[PDB]
mmCIF file of C-alpha atoms in Angstrom:
data_model
loop_
_atom_site.group_PDB
_atom_site.id
_atom_site.type_symbol
_atom_site.label_atom_id
_atom_site.label_comp_id
_atom_site.label_asym_id
_atom_site.label_seq_id
_atom_site.Cartn_x
_atom_site.Cartn_y
_atom_site.Cartn_z
ATOM 1 C CA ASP A 1 30.091 9.967 -32.833
ATOM 2 C CA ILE A 2 26.763 8.366 -33.802
ATOM 3 C CA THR A 3 23.214 9.789 -33.425
ATOM 4 C CA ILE A 4 19.925 8.041 -32.571
ATOM 5 C CA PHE A 5 17.448 10.877 -33.081
ATOM 6 C CA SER A 6 16.788 12.974 -36.185
ATOM 7 C CA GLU A 7 16.218 16.756 -35.832
ATOM 8 C CA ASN A 8 12.399 16.500 -35.519
ATOM 9 C CA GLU A 9 12.558 13.519 -33.129
ATOM 10 C CA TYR A 10 15.161 15.389 -31.016
ATOM 11 C CA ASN A 11 12.899 18.447 -30.617
ATOM 12 C CA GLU A 12 9.750 16.432 -29.837
ATOM 13 C CA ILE A 13 11.560 14.327 -27.190
ATOM 14 C CA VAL A 14 12.999 17.516 -25.608
ATOM 15 C CA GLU A 15 9.379 18.719 -25.159
ATOM 16 C CA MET A 16 8.419 15.257 -23.759
ATOM 17 C CA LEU A 17 11.257 15.445 -21.197
ATOM 18 C CA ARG A 18 10.071 18.931 -20.176
ATOM 19 C CA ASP A 19 6.437 17.755 -19.777
ATOM 20 C CA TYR A 20 7.716 14.712 -17.837
ATOM 21 C CA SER A 21 9.579 16.895 -15.307
ATOM 22 C CA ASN A 22 6.540 19.174 -14.881
ATOM 23 C CA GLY A 23 3.593 16.787 -14.634
ATOM 24 C CA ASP A 24 2.629 14.737 -11.577
ATOM 25 C CA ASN A 25 2.724 10.930 -11.860
ATOM 26 C CA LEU A 26 4.175 11.016 -15.388
ATOM 27 C CA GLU A 27 6.585 8.257 -16.392
ATOM 28 C CA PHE A 28 9.190 8.396 -19.170
ATOM 29 C CA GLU A 29 10.132 5.096 -20.772
ATOM 30 C CA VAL A 30 12.198 3.892 -23.724
ATOM 31 C CA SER A 31 10.956 0.461 -24.817
ATOM 32 C CA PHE A 32 13.239 -1.794 -26.896
ATOM 33 C CA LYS A 33 11.405 -3.875 -29.474
ATOM 34 C CA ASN A 34 12.134 -7.457 -30.536
ATOM 35 C CA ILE A 35 14.144 -8.613 -27.524
ATOM 36 C CA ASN A 36 14.454 -12.414 -27.686
ATOM 37 C CA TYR A 37 15.743 -15.093 -25.267
ATOM 38 C CA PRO A 38 19.490 -14.807 -26.107
ATOM 39 C CA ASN A 39 19.232 -10.975 -25.778
ATOM 40 C CA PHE A 40 17.475 -11.460 -22.408
ATOM 41 C CA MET A 41 20.271 -13.749 -21.188
ATOM 42 C CA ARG A 42 23.047 -11.409 -22.314
ATOM 43 C CA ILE A 43 21.451 -8.279 -20.775
ATOM 44 C CA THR A 44 20.620 -9.920 -17.396
ATOM 45 C CA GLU A 45 24.085 -11.498 -17.062
ATOM 46 C CA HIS A 46 25.807 -8.220 -18.093
ATOM 47 C CA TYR A 47 24.113 -6.098 -15.419
ATOM 48 C CA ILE A 48 23.976 -8.691 -12.570
ATOM 49 C CA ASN A 49 27.770 -9.039 -12.728
ATOM 50 C CA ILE A 50 28.658 -5.324 -12.617
ATOM 51 C CA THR A 51 25.798 -3.570 -10.760
ATOM 52 C CA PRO A 52 26.237 -3.171 -6.961
ATOM 53 C CA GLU A 53 23.894 -5.474 -4.966
ATOM 54 C CA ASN A 54 21.816 -2.648 -3.419
ATOM 55 C CA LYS A 55 21.078 -1.259 -6.911
ATOM 56 C CA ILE A 56 19.610 -4.611 -8.082
ATOM 57 C CA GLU A 57 15.896 -5.327 -7.500
ATOM 58 C CA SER A 58 14.419 -8.731 -8.431
ATOM 59 C CA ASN A 59 10.607 -9.278 -8.442
ATOM 60 C CA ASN A 60 8.191 -12.071 -9.472
ATOM 61 C CA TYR A 61 4.601 -10.799 -9.845
ATOM 62 C CA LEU A 62 1.209 -11.020 -11.541
ATOM 63 C CA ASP A 63 -0.220 -7.972 -13.322
ATOM 64 C CA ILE A 64 -4.001 -8.014 -13.831
ATOM 65 C CA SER A 65 -5.009 -5.307 -16.267
ATOM 66 C CA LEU A 66 -8.662 -4.230 -16.550
ATOM 67 C CA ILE A 67 -8.993 -2.403 -19.854
ATOM 68 C CA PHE A 68 -12.040 -0.095 -19.900
ATOM 69 C CA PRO A 69 -13.937 1.079 -23.067
ATOM 70 C CA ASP A 70 -12.175 4.483 -22.876
ATOM 71 C CA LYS A 71 -8.865 2.552 -23.391
ATOM 72 C CA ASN A 72 -7.595 3.428 -19.887
ATOM 73 C CA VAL A 73 -6.372 0.726 -17.502
ATOM 74 C CA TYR A 74 -6.863 -0.254 -13.855
ATOM 75 C CA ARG A 75 -3.892 -2.502 -13.074
ATOM 76 C CA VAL A 76 -3.418 -4.639 -9.970
ATOM 77 C CA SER A 77 -0.039 -6.211 -9.206
ATOM 78 C CA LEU A 78 0.133 -9.201 -6.824
ATOM 79 C CA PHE A 79 3.591 -9.818 -5.307
ATOM 80 C CA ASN A 80 2.774 -12.542 -2.777
ATOM 81 C CA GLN A 81 3.564 -15.869 -4.517
ATOM 82 C CA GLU A 82 0.889 -17.776 -2.565
ATOM 83 C CA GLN A 83 -1.837 -15.191 -3.347
ATOM 84 C CA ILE A 84 -0.892 -15.471 -7.065
ATOM 85 C CA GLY A 85 -1.383 -19.251 -6.830
ATOM 86 C CA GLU A 86 -4.685 -18.855 -4.948
ATOM 87 C CA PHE A 87 -5.953 -16.322 -7.520
ATOM 88 C CA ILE A 88 -5.077 -18.616 -10.449
ATOM 89 C CA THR A 89 -6.736 -21.642 -8.755
ATOM 90 C CA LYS A 90 -9.923 -19.893 -7.545
ATOM 91 C CA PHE A 91 -10.566 -17.924 -10.760
ATOM 92 C CA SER A 92 -9.584 -20.366 -13.564
ATOM 93 C CA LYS A 93 -13.264 -21.104 -14.366
ATOM 94 C CA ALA A 94 -14.656 -17.639 -13.536
ATOM 95 C CA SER A 95 -16.139 -15.112 -15.987
ATOM 96 C CA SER A 96 -14.498 -11.762 -16.814
ATOM 97 C CA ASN A 97 -17.285 -9.979 -14.863
ATOM 98 C CA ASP A 98 -16.645 -12.088 -11.713
ATOM 99 C CA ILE A 99 -12.863 -11.565 -11.988
ATOM 100 C CA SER A 100 -13.250 -7.788 -12.581
ATOM 101 C CA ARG A 101 -15.586 -7.502 -9.536
ATOM 102 C CA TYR A 102 -12.971 -9.171 -7.314
ATOM 103 C CA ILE A 103 -10.054 -7.142 -8.787
ATOM 104 C CA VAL A 104 -11.619 -3.760 -7.930
ATOM 105 C CA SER A 105 -12.523 -5.017 -4.445
ATOM 106 C CA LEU A 106 -8.842 -5.499 -3.559
ATOM 107 C CA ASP A 107 -7.276 -2.896 -1.291
ATOM 108 C CA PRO A 108 -3.664 -1.614 -1.733
ATOM 109 C CA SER A 109 -0.874 -2.942 0.518
ATOM 110 C CA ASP A 110 2.847 -3.856 0.395
ATOM 111 C CA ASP A 111 1.996 -7.025 -1.575
ATOM 112 C CA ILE A 112 -0.775 -5.425 -3.681
ATOM 113 C CA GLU A 113 0.130 -2.440 -5.880
ATOM 114 C CA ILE A 114 -2.668 -0.617 -7.711
ATOM 115 C CA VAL A 115 -2.257 1.886 -10.547
ATOM 116 C CA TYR A 116 -4.615 3.708 -12.908
ATOM 117 C CA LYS A 117 -2.973 4.160 -16.319
ATOM 118 C CA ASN A 118 -4.334 7.139 -18.252
ATOM 119 C CA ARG A 119 -3.478 6.101 -21.819
ATOM 120 C CA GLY A 120 -5.257 9.189 -23.159
ATOM 121 C CA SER A 121 -2.412 11.327 -21.782
ATOM 122 C CA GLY A 122 0.001 9.064 -23.655
ATOM 123 C CA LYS A 123 2.613 10.531 -25.973
ATOM 124 C CA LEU A 124 4.315 7.926 -28.160
ATOM 125 C CA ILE A 125 7.237 8.399 -30.596
ATOM 126 C CA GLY A 126 8.711 5.526 -32.587
ATOM 127 C CA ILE A 127 12.320 5.633 -33.834
ATOM 128 C CA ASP A 128 11.984 3.242 -36.804
ATOM 129 C CA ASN A 129 15.717 2.987 -37.500
ATOM 130 C CA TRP A 130 16.567 1.835 -33.948
ATOM 131 C CA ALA A 131 13.522 -0.361 -33.131
ATOM 132 C CA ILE A 132 12.676 1.656 -30.013
ATOM 133 C CA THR A 133 9.667 3.546 -28.741
ATOM 134 C CA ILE A 134 9.832 6.644 -26.528
ATOM 135 C CA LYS A 135 6.756 6.920 -24.303
ATOM 136 C CA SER A 136 5.448 9.255 -21.627
ATOM 137 C CA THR A 137 2.280 8.165 -19.771
ATOM 138 C CA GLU A 138 0.398 9.134 -16.602
ATOM 139 C CA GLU A 139 0.303 6.388 -14.001
ATOM 140 C CA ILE A 140 -1.582 7.315 -10.824
ATOM 141 C CA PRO A 141 -0.695 5.060 -7.850
ATOM 142 C CA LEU A 142 -3.695 4.285 -5.661
ATOM 143 C CA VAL A 143 -2.145 3.777 -2.217
ATOM 144 C CA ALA A 144 -3.329 3.349 1.395
ATOM 145 C CA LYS A 145 -10.191 7.551 0.272
ATOM 146 C CA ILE A 146 -9.662 5.543 -2.955
ATOM 147 C CA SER A 147 -12.221 6.293 -5.696
ATOM 148 C CA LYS A 148 -12.230 3.231 -7.965
ATOM 149 C CA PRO A 149 -13.670 3.043 -11.522
ATOM 150 C CA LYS A 150 -17.090 1.459 -12.011
ATOM 151 C CA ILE A 151 -17.419 -2.062 -13.437
ATOM 152 C CA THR A 152 -20.051 -2.087 -16.216
ATOM 153 C CA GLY A 153 -19.291 -5.538 -17.636
ATOM 154 C CA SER A 154 -17.611 -4.411 -20.879
ATOM 155 C CA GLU A 155 -14.055 -4.583 -19.460
ATOM 156 C CA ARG A 156 -11.353 -6.695 -21.145
ATOM 157 C CA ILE A 157 -8.761 -8.455 -18.966
ATOM 158 C CA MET A 158 -5.086 -9.149 -19.712
ATOM 159 C CA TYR A 159 -2.874 -11.193 -17.398
ATOM 160 C CA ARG A 160 0.907 -10.833 -17.320
ATOM 161 C CA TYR A 161 3.142 -12.979 -15.079
ATOM 162 C CA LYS A 162 6.465 -11.174 -14.804
ATOM 163 C CA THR A 163 9.972 -12.089 -13.603
ATOM 164 C CA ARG A 164 11.602 -8.640 -13.563
ATOM 165 C CA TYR A 165 15.216 -7.627 -12.935
ATOM 166 C CA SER A 166 15.657 -3.881 -12.338
ATOM 167 C CA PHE A 167 19.093 -2.189 -12.389
ATOM 168 C CA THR A 168 19.651 1.367 -11.168
ATOM 169 C CA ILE A 169 22.580 2.384 -13.379
ATOM 170 C CA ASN A 170 22.772 5.921 -11.899
ATOM 171 C CA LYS A 171 20.633 8.403 -9.937
ATOM 172 C CA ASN A 172 18.305 9.245 -12.850
ATOM 173 C CA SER A 173 17.989 5.993 -14.799
ATOM 174 C CA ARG A 174 16.936 2.365 -14.445
ATOM 175 C CA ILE A 175 17.144 -0.630 -16.805
ATOM 176 C CA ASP A 176 14.168 -3.006 -16.533
ATOM 177 C CA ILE A 177 14.531 -6.424 -18.145
ATOM 178 C CA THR A 178 11.513 -8.735 -17.918
ATOM 179 C CA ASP A 179 10.562 -12.348 -18.770
ATOM 180 C CA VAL A 180 6.790 -11.974 -19.380
ATOM 181 C CA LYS A 181 4.072 -14.610 -19.797
ATOM 182 C CA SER A 182 1.050 -12.862 -21.363
ATOM 183 C CA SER A 183 -2.467 -14.236 -21.829
ATOM 184 C CA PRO A 184 -6.157 -13.183 -21.588
ATOM 185 C CA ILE A 185 -6.873 -16.693 -20.165
ATOM 186 C CA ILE A 186 -5.823 -17.513 -16.532
ATOM 187 C CA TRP A 187 -5.167 -21.305 -16.571
ATOM 188 C CA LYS A 188 -3.026 -20.958 -19.738
ATOM 189 C CA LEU A 189 -0.805 -18.104 -18.438
ATOM 190 C CA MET A 190 1.997 -19.980 -16.610
ATOM 191 C CA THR A 191 2.624 -22.233 -19.652
ATOM 192 C CA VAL A 192 2.423 -19.780 -22.610
ATOM 193 C CA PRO A 193 5.802 -18.991 -24.371
ATOM 194 C CA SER A 194 7.652 -16.051 -22.794
ATOM 195 C CA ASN A 195 8.009 -12.679 -24.502
ATOM 196 C CA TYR A 196 10.873 -10.403 -23.429
ATOM 197 C CA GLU A 197 10.652 -6.756 -22.502
ATOM 198 C CA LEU A 198 13.476 -4.254 -22.075
ATOM 199 C CA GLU A 199 13.094 -0.649 -20.991
ATOM 200 C CA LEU A 200 15.177 2.336 -19.917
ATOM 201 C CA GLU A 201 13.009 4.096 -17.310
ATOM 202 C CA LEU A 202 13.789 7.577 -16.005
ATOM 203 C CA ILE A 203 13.652 8.359 -12.279
ATOM 204 C CA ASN A 204 14.297 12.089 -12.967
ATOM 205 C CA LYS A 205 14.543 14.253 -16.107
ATOM 206 C CA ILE A 206 17.871 14.196 -17.958
ATOM 207 C CA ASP A 207 19.292 16.058 -20.929
ATOM 208 C CA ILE A 208 18.384 14.329 -24.217
ATOM 209 C CA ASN A 209 22.110 13.996 -25.034
ATOM 210 C CA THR A 210 22.577 12.001 -21.796
ATOM 211 C CA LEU A 211 19.553 9.890 -22.897
ATOM 212 C CA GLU A 212 21.239 9.304 -26.286
ATOM 213 C CA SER A 213 24.484 8.089 -24.654
ATOM 214 C CA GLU A 214 22.618 5.764 -22.259
ATOM 215 C CA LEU A 215 20.553 4.268 -25.090
ATOM 216 C CA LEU A 216 23.751 3.825 -27.176
ATOM 217 C CA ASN A 217 25.283 1.860 -24.261
ATOM 218 C CA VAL A 218 22.301 -0.558 -24.235
ATOM 219 C CA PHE A 219 22.471 -0.939 -28.046
ATOM 220 C CA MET A 220 26.180 -1.841 -27.702
ATOM 221 C CA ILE A 221 25.258 -4.784 -25.410
ATOM 222 C CA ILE A 222 22.433 -5.962 -27.745
ATOM 223 C CA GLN A 223 24.343 -5.711 -31.075
ATOM 224 C CA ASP A 224 26.196 -8.642 -32.664
#
C-alpha cells in the first residue's frame, strides 16, 4: 500500500478529472519525465509481448507545430511517409513565413490530422516526488467550414518526427510511448538525437484511485 498523491494533489486532480469528463475536446494526460533509451526499450517490449494485436497501434508521423504569440498552437500531423519526405525536401531552405503559409493551407484528411491546442485552458500539476506531470488541455480537432487562425509572420515553428506505439490497456486508458526527433530546423530533424516520451492518456474519466493503481503499474516497469 503505497501512495502517489498527497492530500492537496489528490483533491486538485479529482477536480481535474471532473472538468475532463464535463468539457468538450478536453484531454487528460499523465506525462512521465526523464524517460531514456533503455526505459523506452523495456516499456515497448513489455507491452508488445502482452497486449492483444488489435489493441496495439503503431504510427510514424511528422508534427508541425505553429506556435502563435498568444501561446496557443495550430498543429498539423502528416502520416503519409512520402508526403513527409516531400515536405522536408521542398521546405528545407524556406523561411518560417513561407512554411507557415503552406501549413495553414493544408486541408484535413485521413493522412493529414489538424488540431488547435488551446494552452490557455491548460491545467498543469507536477508531482515532484514521482517525476510526473498531470495535464488537462483542450485540443479541438479540425476535421472535414474550417475557420483557420491568421498568419501574421510572428509564428514560431517546431518540428517533431515521431515513431509512436500506443497500447490500449483497458477501456478507459492508453499508454503512449514515443521515440521523438525534435528540432526548429527542418533539414536537421531526421538526424538529431532522439528524446523519449511516455504518457498515460485517458479515453474516459476514471476514479483517481484507479489512476493511482495504473500509474503504480507503469512505475513498476520503469524502476530498477
